[PDB]
Amino acid sequence: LSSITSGASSNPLAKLDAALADVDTLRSSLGAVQNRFDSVISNLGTTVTN
Amino acid sequence: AQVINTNSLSLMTQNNLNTSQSALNTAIQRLSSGLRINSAKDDAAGQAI
Amino acid sequence: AQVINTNSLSLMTQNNLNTSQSALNTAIQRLSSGLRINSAKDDAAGQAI
Amino acid sequence: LSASRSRIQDADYATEVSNMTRAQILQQAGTSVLAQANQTTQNVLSLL
Amino acid sequence: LSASRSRIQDADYATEVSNMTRAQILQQAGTSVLAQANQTTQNVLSLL
Amino acid sequence: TGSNSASDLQSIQDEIKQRLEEINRVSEQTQFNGVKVLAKDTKMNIQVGANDGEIIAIDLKEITAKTLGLDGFNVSGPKGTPAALVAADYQAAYGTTTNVTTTAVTESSANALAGRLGVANGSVALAATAEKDDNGNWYATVTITAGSATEVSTLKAKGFEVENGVAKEFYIALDPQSADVTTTAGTAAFALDTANIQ
Amino acid sequence: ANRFTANIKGLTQAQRNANDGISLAQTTEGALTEVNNNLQRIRELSVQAATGSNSASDLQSIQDEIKQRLEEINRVSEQTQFNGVKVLAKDTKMNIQVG
Amino acid sequence: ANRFTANIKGLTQAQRNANDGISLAQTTEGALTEVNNNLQRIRELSVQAA
Numbered sequence: 001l002s003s004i005t006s007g008a009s010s011n012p013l014a015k016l017d018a019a020l021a022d023v024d025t026l027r028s029s030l031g032a033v034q035n036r037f038d039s040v041i042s043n044l045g046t047t048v049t050n
Numbered sequence: 051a052q053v054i055n056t057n058s059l060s061l062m063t064q065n066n067l068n069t070s071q072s073a074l075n076t077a078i079q080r081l082s083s084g085l086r087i088n089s090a091k092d093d094a095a096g097q098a099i
Numbered sequence: 100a101q102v103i104n105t106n107s108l109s110l111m112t113q114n115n116l117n118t119s120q121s122a123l124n125t126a127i128q129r130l131s132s133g134l135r136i137n138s139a140k141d142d143a144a145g146q147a148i
Numbered sequence: 149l150s151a152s153r154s155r156i157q158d159a160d161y162a163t164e165v166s167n168m169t170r171a172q173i174l175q176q177a178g179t180s181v182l183a184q185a186n187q188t189t190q191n192v193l194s195l196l
Numbered sequence: 197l198s199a200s201r202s203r204i205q206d207a208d209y210a211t212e213v214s215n216m217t218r219a220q221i222l223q224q225a226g227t228s229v230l231a232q233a234n235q236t237t238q239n240v241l242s243l244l
Numbered sequence: 245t246g247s248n249s250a251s252d253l254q255s256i257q258d259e260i261k262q263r264l265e266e267i268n269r270v271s272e273q274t275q276f277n278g279v280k281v282l283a284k285d286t287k288m289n290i291q292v293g294a295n296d297g298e299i300i301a302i303d304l305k306e307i308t309a310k311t312l313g314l315d316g317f318n319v320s321g322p323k324g325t326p327a328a329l330v331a332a333d334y335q336a337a338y339g340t341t342t343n344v345t346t347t348a349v350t351e352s353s354a355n356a357l358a359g360r361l362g363v364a365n366g367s368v369a370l371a372a373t374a375e376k377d378d379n380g381n382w383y384a385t386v387t388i389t390a391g392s393a394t395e396v397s398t399l400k401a402k403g404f405e406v407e408n409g410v411a412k413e414f415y416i417a418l419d420p421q422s423a424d425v426t427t428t429a430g431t432a433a434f435a436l437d438t439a440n441i442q
Numbered sequence: 443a444n445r446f447t448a449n450i451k452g453l454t455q456a457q458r459n460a461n462d463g464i465s466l467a468q469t470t471e472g473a474l475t476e477v478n479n480n481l482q483r484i485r486e487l488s489v490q491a492a493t494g495s496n497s498a499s500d501l502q503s504i505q506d507e508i509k510q511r512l513e514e515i516n517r518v519s520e521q522t523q524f525n526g527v528k529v530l531a532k533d534t535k536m537n538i539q540v541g
Numbered sequence: 542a543n544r545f546t547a548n549i550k551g552l553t554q555a556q557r558n559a560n561d562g563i564s565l566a567q568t569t570e571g572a573l574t575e576v577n578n579n580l581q582r583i584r585e586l587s588v589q590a591a
Contacts, residue, residue, distance in 0.1 A: 002502055002506070003502070005505075012488050013485070013488060013489070016481065016484065016485045016488065019481060020478075020481055020482075020485075021251070023474060023477065023478055023481065024097070024098045025254075025442070026474065027090045027094070027097065027471065027474055028090055028094035028095075028097075028098070028254075028255040028258065029258065030090060030467055030470060030471050030474075031089065031090030031091045031092075031094045031259075031471075032094065032258050032259045032261075032262050033262070033467055034091045034464060034467050034468075035091055035259065035262070036262045036263075036265075036266060037460060037463060037464050037467075038464075039266060040460050040540055041457065041460055041461075043270065044453055044456060044457050044460075045065050045068075045457075046065065047274075047453065048450060048453050048454065049058075049061050049062060049065055052191065052192040052195075054189050054192055057185070057186070057188075057189060059185040059188070060182065060185045060186055063178065063181060063182045063185055064100075064182070066178070067100070067175070067178045067179075067182070068100060070171055070174045070175045070178065071100070071175065073167065073171045074168070074171040074172065074175055075108065077164050077167040077168040077171060078108055078168065079108075079111065080159050080164050081159070081161070081164050081165075081168070082111070082112045082115050083115060083159075084158070084159060085157050085158050085159050086157055086158060086159050086160075087156075087157045089471060090471070094255045094256075094259065095252050095255045095256050096156055096157065098251075098252060098255065099156060099249075099252065103218070103221050103222065103225070104218075104222075105218075106214065106218070109210075109214050113210050113211070116210075143503045143504075143507065144490065144491075144500055144503045144504050147499070147500065147503065148500065149568075151564070151567075152564040152567075152568065155560050155561075155564060245558045245561065247558075247561050247562065247565060273541060277445070277446075278445075
C-alpha cells in the first residue's frame with residue numbers, strides 16, 4: 001500500500017524558498033517587538049523613582 | 051532633612067543595578083553558545099542573510 | 100532582579116551542552132566503525148542502493 | 149561561502165571575556181554602596 | 197539493553213549540583229532571619 | 245551599503261518604525277500633576293518671594309516626530325522622482341534589436357486590493373504604465389483616496405497613513421525578465437497577483 | 443499627595459504586565475526556530491531526489507521521510523500554547539496594557 | 542561625549558561593511574580561475590588540429 005501514489009508537484013524548490021521567506025518575516029517582526037518592550041521597562045523604573 | 055519614612059538613595063541604587071545585570075547575562079550567554087546571533091532580537095537583518 | 104529560589108542561566112547552559120555532546124558522539128563513532136552509514140537513520144535512501 | 153557566513157554570526161572570545169570581567173566587578177561594587185546607603189537613616193535615632 | 201536501563205536508572209550531575217547550591221543558600225538565610233526574629237521582643241522591656 | 249537585498253531593507257524599516265513610534269508615545273503620555281510637559285510650548289512661573297511680581301521663568305518646548313523634522317522618515321523604496329521609459333532602457337533590458345515600445349500593467353482579479361484593505365471601490369486606483377527611478381529599477385504606482393474619517397482610521401489600523409480628500413502614491417517593484425512579451429507584438433504586459441502580495 | 447500615590451501603584455502594575463508580554467513573545471519564537479530546522483532538511487532531500495540516475499523504488503524512501511517531517515509542522519502548530527492561548531493560529535493581534 | 546558616542550557607534554558598523562566587500566571580491570576570483578583553466582586547454586587542443 002505504499003506504491004499507490006498521487007501526482008508529483010511542479011517547481012518544488014521555488015515553493016520551499018517562498019516558505020522559508022515567510023518564516024523569516026515573522027521572526028523579524030517578533031524581534032522588533034521585543035526590542036521595543038525593553039525601553040518601556042527602563043522608562044517606568046526611572047519615572048516611579050522620581 | 052532627616053526623614054525616615056522613605057529613603058531615596060536606596061531606590062536609585064536598586065534602579066542602577068539592573069543595567070549591569072543585563073550586560074552580564076548577555077556576555078555569559080554568548081560564551082556558552084558559541085556565536086553572536088542567538089535570536090532575532092540581536093539583529094533581524096543578519097539572521098535572514 | 101535578585102532572586103535565589105531559581106536560577107535561569109544554569110538551565111540555559113545545561114540545555115545548551117547537549118548539542119555539542121551529540122556531535123561528539125557521532126564523530127567518535129564514525130572513526131571507529133570505519134564507514135559512514137551505520138544505521139538507516141543516517142540516510143535511508145542510500146543504504147538500499 | 150562558509151568563510152563569508154562565518155564572518156557574520158560568530159563570536160569573538162576576546163571581547164566577551166573582557167566584557168564579562170568588567171560587568172562582574174561593577175556588579176560587585178554596586179552592592180557595597182547599597183549597603184552603605186541604608187545605614188544613613190540610623191543617624192536620626194540618636195537625636196532621641 | 198544496558199543503554200536503556202542506564203537511561204531509566206542513572207542520575208544526572210549538573211542538576212544535582214545546582215540543587216545543592218540552591219538548598220545551601222536558603223539554609224543560611226533562614227538561620228540569619230531566625231536570629232533576627234527571636235531578637236524582636238526585647239524592646240517591650242524598655243517600656244518599664 | 246551596496247551589497248544588500250531588496251527584502252532585507254523591509255526588516256530594518258520596520259524596526260525603525262517601532263523606534264519612531266516610541267518617541268510619540270513617551271511625548272504624549274508623560275505628565276507631572278496632570279500637566280503635559282512635552283507639548284504646546286508655554287512657559288511656567290514659580291513664586292519665590294514675599295511680594296508679588298517675584299517669579300522665575302521656566303520654558304518648555306514641544307518634542308515629537310514632526311517638530312524634529314523626521315516625519316515620514318524612510319529607508320526603503322525608490323530613490324528620486326520616477327520618470328518615463330525611453331528607447332535606451334528597452335534596449336538595455338531586452339537587446340539592441342528589440343520590438344518592445346510600450347508597457348501595460350493590470351490586476352489579476354478586478355478590485356481585489358480594495359477588498360483586502362477594507363474600503364469601498366473607487367478609493368483605490370492603479371496606474372497603467374511602468375516607471376523607473378534614478379538607478380534603473382522599474383516600479384508600478386498606486387493611488388489611494390479616503391472618503392470619510394473611518395476610512396482613514398481603518399487604513400491607519402492596517403498600516404497606511406493618509407489624509408482624507410488628498411491623494412498619495414505608493415510604489416510596487418517589478419522584474420523586467422518576467423514580463424509577457426509574446427502575446428502582443430511590441431508590448432510587454434505585466435499582471436500583478438494583488439490578492440496575495442505581502 | 444493622594445493623586446501622586448494613585449499614580450504610583452498603576453505604574454508598578456504596568457511593569458508586571460510588560461514582563462508577561464515579553465515572556466509570550468519568547469515562547470512563540472522558540473517554536474518558530476524548530477519549524478525552520480525541519481524546513482531546511484526537507485529542502486536538502488528535495489535536491490537529493492531530482493537526479494536522473496535513481497530507481498523508482500528509491501523515491502518512496504525519500505517520500506515517507508518527507509511525510510513524517512511534514513506532519514511535524516502541523517502537530518507543533520496545533521499543540522503549542524501559552525496560558526490557554528493558542529499562539530500559532532487564528533491571525534489575531536494581542537494588546538498589552540502598558541500605562 | 543554624546544558626539545563621540547555617535548562616531549564610535551557608526552564606525553563599528555562601517556568596519557563590518559568592509560568585510561562584506563572583501564567576501565564578494567574573494568568569491569569572484571575562484572570562479573574566474575576555472576574559466577582560465579578551460580581556455581588554457583582549448584589553445585593546446587587547437588595546436589594539435591593544425
